[PDB]
Design an enzyme around this catalytic site. Structure first.
Site, PDB file in Angstrom:
ATOM      1  N   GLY A 127      -8.572  41.169  38.262  1.00 35.90           N
ATOM      2  CA  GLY A 127      -9.438  40.132  37.724  1.00 35.90           C
ATOM      3  C   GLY A 127      -9.110  38.852  38.471  1.00 35.90           C
ATOM      4  N   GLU A 129     -10.925  40.382  29.483  1.00 35.45           N
ATOM      5  CA  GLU A 129     -10.327  40.735  30.770  1.00 35.45           C
ATOM      6  C   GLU A 129      -9.976  42.220  30.824  1.00 35.45           C
ATOM      7  OE1 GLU A 129      -8.493  37.698  32.739  1.00 35.45           O
ATOM      8  OE2 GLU A 129      -7.803  38.912  34.448  1.00 35.45           O
ATOM      9  N   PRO A 132     -15.692  31.238  14.681  1.00 34.71           N
ATOM     10  CA  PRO A 132     -14.364  31.781  14.384  1.00 34.71           C
ATOM     11  C   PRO A 132     -14.476  33.109  13.646  1.00 34.71           C
ATOM     12  CG  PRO A 132     -14.934  30.129  12.742  1.00 34.71           C
ATOM     13  CD  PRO A 132     -16.087  30.170  13.741  1.00 34.71           C
TER      14      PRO A 132
HETATM   15  C1  LIG Z   1      -6.096  39.579  46.095  1.00 34.48           C
HETATM   16  C2  LIG Z   1      -6.639  38.209  45.617  1.00 34.48           C
HETATM   17  C3  LIG Z   1      -7.682  38.388  44.519  1.00 34.48           C
HETATM   18  C4  LIG Z   1      -7.150  37.423  46.832  1.00 34.48           C
HETATM   19  O1  LIG Z   1      -6.219  37.379  47.850  1.00 34.48           O
HETATM   20  P1  LIG Z   1      -5.912  36.038  48.675  1.00 34.48           P
HETATM   21  O2  LIG Z   1      -6.908  34.903  48.351  1.00 34.48           O
HETATM   22  O3  LIG Z   1      -6.029  36.361  50.144  1.00 34.48           O
HETATM   23  O4  LIG Z   1      -4.447  35.567  48.359  1.00 34.48           O
HETATM   24  P2  LIG Z   1      -3.287  35.990  49.323  1.00 34.48           P
HETATM   25  O5  LIG Z   1      -3.479  37.375  49.828  1.00 34.48           O
HETATM   26  O6  LIG Z   1      -3.213  35.042  50.514  1.00 34.48           O
HETATM   27  O7  LIG Z   1      -1.969  35.949  48.486  1.00 34.48           O
HETATM   28  C5  LIG Z   1      -1.845  36.831  47.363  1.00 34.48           C
HETATM   29  C6  LIG Z   1      -0.775  37.946  47.487  1.00 34.48           C
HETATM   30  O8  LIG Z   1      -1.295  39.275  47.238  1.00 34.48           O
HETATM   31  C7  LIG Z   1      -0.532  40.066  48.185  1.00 34.48           C
HETATM   32  N1  LIG Z   1      -0.785  41.502  48.315  1.00 34.48           N
HETATM   33  C8  LIG Z   1      -1.947  42.176  48.040  1.00 34.48           C
HETATM   34  N2  LIG Z   1      -1.771  43.509  48.258  1.00 34.48           N
HETATM   35  C9  LIG Z   1      -0.469  43.701  48.672  1.00 34.48           C
HETATM   36  C10 LIG Z   1       0.278  44.840  49.040  1.00 34.48           C
HETATM   37  N3  LIG Z   1      -0.358  46.214  49.024  1.00 34.48           N
HETATM   38  N4  LIG Z   1       1.580  44.698  49.411  1.00 34.48           N
HETATM   39  C11 LIG Z   1       2.164  43.480  49.428  1.00 34.48           C
HETATM   40  N5  LIG Z   1       1.470  42.373  49.079  1.00 34.48           N
HETATM   41  C12 LIG Z   1       0.165  42.436  48.702  1.00 34.48           C
HETATM   42  C13 LIG Z   1      -0.584  39.113  49.396  1.00 34.48           C
HETATM   43  O9  LIG Z   1       0.226  39.440  50.462  1.00 34.48           O
HETATM   44  C14 LIG Z   1      -0.231  37.846  48.801  1.00 34.48           C
HETATM   45  O10 LIG Z   1       1.156  37.672  48.689  1.00 34.48           O
HETATM   46  P3  LIG Z   1       1.844  36.496  49.437  1.00 34.48           P
HETATM   47  O11 LIG Z   1       1.708  35.215  48.644  1.00 34.48           O
HETATM   48  O12 LIG Z   1       3.347  36.814  49.623  1.00 34.48           O
HETATM   49  O13 LIG Z   1       1.175  36.308  50.837  1.00 34.48           O
HETATM   50  C15 LIG Z   1      -5.437  37.341  45.032  1.00 34.48           C
HETATM   51  O14 LIG Z   1      -5.852  35.943  44.806  1.00 34.48           O
HETATM   52  C16 LIG Z   1      -4.685  37.925  43.708  1.00 34.48           C
HETATM   53  O15 LIG Z   1      -3.998  38.912  43.757  1.00 34.48           O
HETATM   54  N6  LIG Z   1      -4.899  37.179  42.431  1.00 34.48           N
HETATM   55  C17 LIG Z   1      -4.202  37.737  41.193  1.00 34.48           C
HETATM   56  C18 LIG Z   1      -5.031  38.780  40.458  1.00 34.48           C
HETATM   57  C19 LIG Z   1      -4.354  39.180  39.144  1.00 34.48           C
HETATM   58  O16 LIG Z   1      -3.136  39.385  39.128  1.00 34.48           O
HETATM   59  N7  LIG Z   1      -5.162  39.285  37.927  1.00 34.48           N
HETATM   60  C20 LIG Z   1      -4.481  39.677  36.711  1.00 34.48           C
HETATM   61  C21 LIG Z   1      -4.175  41.144  36.654  1.00 34.48           C
HETATM   62  S1  LIG Z   1      -5.478  42.239  37.065  1.00 34.48           S
HETATM   63  C22 LIG Z   1      -6.659  42.179  35.742  1.00 34.48           C
HETATM   64  C23 LIG Z   1      -6.131  42.764  34.448  1.00 34.48           C
HETATM   65  O17 LIG Z   1      -5.480  42.043  33.669  1.00 34.48           O
HETATM   66  C24 LIG Z   1      -6.390  44.235  34.123  1.00 34.48           C
HETATM   67  C25 LIG Z   1      -6.473  44.678  32.786  1.00 34.48           C
HETATM   68  C26 LIG Z   1      -6.726  46.030  32.516  1.00 34.48           C
HETATM   69  C27 LIG Z   1      -6.895  46.936  33.586  1.00 34.48           C
HETATM   70  C28 LIG Z   1      -6.817  46.505  34.925  1.00 34.48           C
HETATM   71  C29 LIG Z   1      -6.555  45.156  35.197  1.00 34.48           C
HETATM   72  C1  LIG Z   2     -16.482  24.234  15.457  1.00 34.27           C
HETATM   73  C2  LIG Z   2     -17.344  24.578  16.703  1.00 34.27           C
HETATM   74  C3  LIG Z   2     -16.549  24.342  17.987  1.00 34.27           C
HETATM   75  C4  LIG Z   2     -18.634  23.749  16.700  1.00 34.27           C
HETATM   76  O1  LIG Z   2     -19.238  23.691  15.462  1.00 34.27           O
HETATM   77  P1  LIG Z   2     -20.775  24.083  15.246  1.00 34.27           P
HETATM   78  O2  LIG Z   2     -21.387  24.755  16.497  1.00 34.27           O
HETATM   79  O3  LIG Z   2     -21.481  22.789  14.953  1.00 34.27           O
HETATM   80  O4  LIG Z   2     -20.822  25.085  14.019  1.00 34.27           O
HETATM   81  P2  LIG Z   2     -22.021  25.220  13.021  1.00 34.27           P
HETATM   82  O5  LIG Z   2     -22.878  24.010  13.026  1.00 34.27           O
HETATM   83  O6  LIG Z   2     -22.861  26.445  13.372  1.00 34.27           O
HETATM   84  O7  LIG Z   2     -21.415  25.397  11.587  1.00 34.27           O
HETATM   85  C5  LIG Z   2     -20.257  26.208  11.411  1.00 34.27           C
HETATM   86  C6  LIG Z   2     -20.464  27.742  11.546  1.00 34.27           C
HETATM   87  O8  LIG Z   2     -19.246  28.411  11.919  1.00 34.27           O
HETATM   88  C7  LIG Z   2     -18.812  29.155  10.751  1.00 34.27           C
HETATM   89  N1  LIG Z   2     -17.668  28.524  10.150  1.00 34.27           N
HETATM   90  C8  LIG Z   2     -17.520  27.174  10.029  1.00 34.27           C
HETATM   91  N2  LIG Z   2     -16.342  26.910   9.413  1.00 34.27           N
HETATM   92  C9  LIG Z   2     -15.739  28.116   9.134  1.00 34.27           C
HETATM   93  C10 LIG Z   2     -14.526  28.448   8.515  1.00 34.27           C
HETATM   94  N3  LIG Z   2     -13.612  27.352   8.009  1.00 34.27           N
HETATM   95  N4  LIG Z   2     -14.191  29.759   8.381  1.00 34.27           N
HETATM   96  C11 LIG Z   2     -15.010  30.738   8.835  1.00 34.27           C
HETATM   97  N5  LIG Z   2     -16.186  30.444   9.434  1.00 34.27           N
HETATM   98  C12 LIG Z   2     -16.576  29.155   9.598  1.00 34.27           C
HETATM   99  C13 LIG Z   2     -19.971  29.029   9.738  1.00 34.27           C
HETATM  100  O9  LIG Z   2     -20.387  30.243   9.220  1.00 34.27           O
HETATM  101  C14 LIG Z   2     -21.032  28.279  10.358  1.00 34.27           C
HETATM  102  O10 LIG Z   2     -22.041  29.144  10.777  1.00 34.27           O
HETATM  103  P3  LIG Z   2     -23.343  29.302   9.955  1.00 34.27           P
HETATM  104  O11 LIG Z   2     -23.760  27.934   9.320  1.00 34.27           O
HETATM  105  O12 LIG Z   2     -24.422  29.784  10.897  1.00 34.27           O
HETATM  106  O13 LIG Z   2     -23.110  30.346   8.837  1.00 34.27           O
HETATM  107  C15 LIG Z   2     -17.771  26.112  16.592  1.00 34.27           C
HETATM  108  O14 LIG Z   2     -18.564  26.497  17.767  1.00 34.27           O
HETATM  109  C16 LIG Z   2     -16.527  27.162  16.393  1.00 34.27           C
HETATM  110  O15 LIG Z   2     -15.922  27.239  15.351  1.00 34.27           O
HETATM  111  N6  LIG Z   2     -16.132  28.009  17.565  1.00 34.27           N
HETATM  112  C17 LIG Z   2     -14.938  28.951  17.352  1.00 34.27           C
HETATM  113  C18 LIG Z   2     -13.611  28.247  17.643  1.00 34.27           C
HETATM  114  C19 LIG Z   2     -12.405  29.212  17.659  1.00 34.27           C
HETATM  115  O16 LIG Z   2     -12.229  29.936  16.684  1.00 34.27           O
HETATM  116  N7  LIG Z   2     -11.520  29.270  18.837  1.00 34.27           N
HETATM  117  C20 LIG Z   2     -10.410  30.202  18.799  1.00 34.27           C
HETATM  118  C21 LIG Z   2      -9.337  29.871  17.808  1.00 34.27           C
HETATM  119  S1  LIG Z   2      -8.648  28.265  17.882  1.00 34.27           S
HETATM  120  C22 LIG Z   2      -7.666  28.142  19.362  1.00 34.27           C
HETATM  121  C23 LIG Z   2      -6.487  29.104  19.379  1.00 34.27           C
HETATM  122  O17 LIG Z   2      -6.639  30.301  19.689  1.00 34.27           O
HETATM  123  C24 LIG Z   2      -5.105  28.597  18.982  1.00 34.27           C
HETATM  124  C25 LIG Z   2      -3.955  29.254  19.464  1.00 34.27           C
HETATM  125  C26 LIG Z   2      -2.683  28.796  19.101  1.00 34.27           C
HETATM  126  C27 LIG Z   2      -2.576  27.670  18.260  1.00 34.27           C
HETATM  127  C28 LIG Z   2      -3.718  27.014  17.766  1.00 34.27           C
HETATM  128  C29 LIG Z   2      -4.990  27.476  18.119  1.00 34.27           C
END
Ligand SMILES: CC(C)(COP(=O)(O)OP(=O)(O)OC[C@H]1O[C@@H](n2cnc3c(N)ncnc32)[C@H](O)[C@@H]1OP(=O)(O)O)[C@@H](O)C(=O)NCCC(=O)NCCSCC(=O)c1ccccc1
Ligand SMILES: CC(C)(COP(=O)(O)OP(=O)(O)OC[C@H]1O[C@@H](n2cnc3c(N)ncnc32)[C@H](O)[C@@H]1OP(=O)(O)O)[C@@H](O)C(=O)NCCC(=O)NCCSCC(=O)c1ccccc1
EC number: 3.1.2.-
Lengths: 137, 137
Positions: B82, B63, B92
């Site tokens: 976003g 993001e 992993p």
């Molecule tokens: C604007 C969207 C996308 C669509 O609009 P929609 O479908 O028409 O929805 P609505 O407009 O009906 O209602 C929404 C509100 O917005 C308000 N408003 C807007 N402008 C002004 C203003 N000038 N003054 C006052 N108000 C304003 C509206 O008035 C309204 O308020 P209210 O309820 O009181 O009527 C809306 O769904 C949204 O903001 N989603 C959250 C996105 C988000 O936070 N993503 C995460 C962070 S950004 C990504 C990131 O992490 C990042 C990382 C690194 C770098 C950079 C970034």
């Molecule tokens: C296990 C999945 C889902 C499926 O299996 P699959 O598609 O059948 O897998 P394979 O048949 O291809 O065989 C395994 C392969 O993977 C590797 N490997 C295996 N084991 C280990 C290991 N122990 N250590 C290191 N590596 C290991 C092997 O090298 C092997 O590859 P290869 O043979 O080519 O050398 C697999 O896609 C995955 O691990 N996705 C990432 C998930 C993830 O990290 N999500 C985010 C974190 S958890 C959520 C969270 O954030 C959270 C937050 C708060 C609280 C709690 C949580």
């Protein structure tokens, strides 16, 4: 009561030590029968460069909640990993703390699907996420 | 270049001050014609409780990159947000750093869509993300 592995909020919060969870200031705040909740600050640790809550912070809060809930749905020697995450950012957040509320959509033997909704400090829905997990082991 | 704003790497890295970006140790490493890359450590800042890279950290990396890419598509009176994020965790990671690479999929005037791929040190693809952004104003 869905949980198969039982942890207190204290035990849950201790899991966060030396992880991104504690690093974002996330604190688990409620463990219900079928719900897990945590709070997260909207400050420099979670901001984007233009003063809003980073979308990646809501995302991380969602994967955190879904994965730990998933963890509490497994048995010892089993691990839960997030496999698929999606998020829709409905409304911006500029201040306060947000609350993530996580509930099960599907509890499978090898796969789960969790809903996480993020609310701002006025209770308004700001992000809807869904996390798919894999149960390993 | 595709970018509206012609920024520098130094400028991009300066935006990270006092945000989640700096908090996660994310560093922009490449600003090209049509590509933006950044590196992120896999350590306690970005870990989950069982020693792996937190999936929310890859999401946050994605993001960050897609939104900053969208920001570079803005004019002066405008901002970027976003709107939709999705991520698939393929592999992993437990140590070292990962590298996110962001490229455009669609550049509309209201909406944009970015691909972000996250690679481990061996260049193996560990996460694939897609981010929708909105240009406002
Ligand atoms: C604007 C969207 C996308 C669509 O609009 P929609 O479908 O028409 O929805 P609505 O407009 O009906 O209602 C929404 C509100 O917005 C308000 N408003 C807007 N402008 C002004 C203003 N000038 N003054 C006052 N108000 C304003 C509206 O008035 C309204 O308020 P209210 O309820 O009181 O009527 C809306 O769904 C949204 O903001 N989603 C959250 C996105 C988000 O936070 N993503 C995460 C962070 S950004 C990504 C990131 O992490 C990042 C990382 C690194 C770098 C950079 C970034
Ligand atoms: C296990 C999945 C889902 C499926 O299996 P699959 O598609 O059948 O897998 P394979 O048949 O291809 O065989 C395994 C392969 O993977 C590797 N490997 C295996 N084991 C280990 C290991 N122990 N250590 C290191 N590596 C290991 C092997 O090298 C092997 O590859 P290869 O043979 O080519 O050398 C697999 O896609 C995955 O691990 N996705 C990432 C998930 C993830 O990290 N999500 C985010 C974190 S958890 C959520 C969270 O954030 C959270 C937050 C708060 C609280 C709690 C949580």
């Amino acid at each position: 009561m869905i949980w198969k592995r039982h942890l207190t909020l204290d035990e849950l919060n201790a899991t966060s030590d030396n992880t991104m969870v504690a690093h974002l200031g996330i604190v688990y705040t409620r463990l219900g029968d079928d719900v897990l909740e945590a709070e997260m600050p909207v400050d420099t640790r979670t901001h984007q460069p233009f003063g809003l809550l980073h979308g990646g912070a809501s995302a991380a809060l969602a994967e955190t909640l879904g994965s730990m809930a998933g963890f509490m749905m497994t048995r010892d020697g089993q691990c839960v990993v997030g496999t698929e995450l999606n998020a829709t950012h409905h409304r911006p957040v500029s201040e306060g703390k947000v609350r993530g509320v996580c509930q099960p959509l599907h509890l499978g033997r090898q796969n789960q699907s969790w809903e996480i909704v993020v609310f701002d400090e006025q209770g308004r829905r700001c992000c809807t996420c869904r996390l798919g997990t894999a149960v390993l082991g």
